[PDB]
DNA sequence: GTCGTTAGTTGTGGGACTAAAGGATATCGTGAACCGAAAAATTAGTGTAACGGGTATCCCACAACGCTAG
């Protein structure tokens, strides 16, 4: 349980699965600046719930 | 001639092998018979109505005047 890529070590202490997270697919925005991202409203409203 | 030593194999054993998503499975073979345990179902037994004063509360209606004479 605490060897290799799965173990305790490598699985849940060095790397975890966190909250107030998202994940989608990537379009190109060519008008926005260097600084900034376009996050979808559902998104959003559940990133920012609290 | 014989015994311990050193270095170079040689065979064998233990330890590594991106990151992101997802994430459904199927799982044989049989020997008997009696006793004990507890969990469940079935059965057997008892019953009020108004009254006296006296007084606590409720709803429900009404009152809570005006004038004259000795």
Same mark, same amino acid.
């Given at each position: 349980?605490?060897?290799?890529?799965?173990?305790?070590?490598?699985?849940?202490?060095?790397?975890?699965?966190? @909250?107030?997270?998202?994940?989608?697919?990537?379009?190109?925005?060519?008008?926005?600046?260097?600084?900034?991202?376009?996050?979808?409203? @559902?998104?959003?409203?559940?990133?920012?719930?609290?």
């Amino acid at each position: 349980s605490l060897k290799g890529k799965q173990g305790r070590f490598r699985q849940n202490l060095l790397g975890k699965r966190v @909250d107030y997270s998202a994940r989608s697919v990537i379009v190109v925005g060519p008008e926005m600046k260097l600084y900034e991202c376009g996050l979808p409203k @559902d998104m959003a409203a559940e990133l920012y719930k609290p």
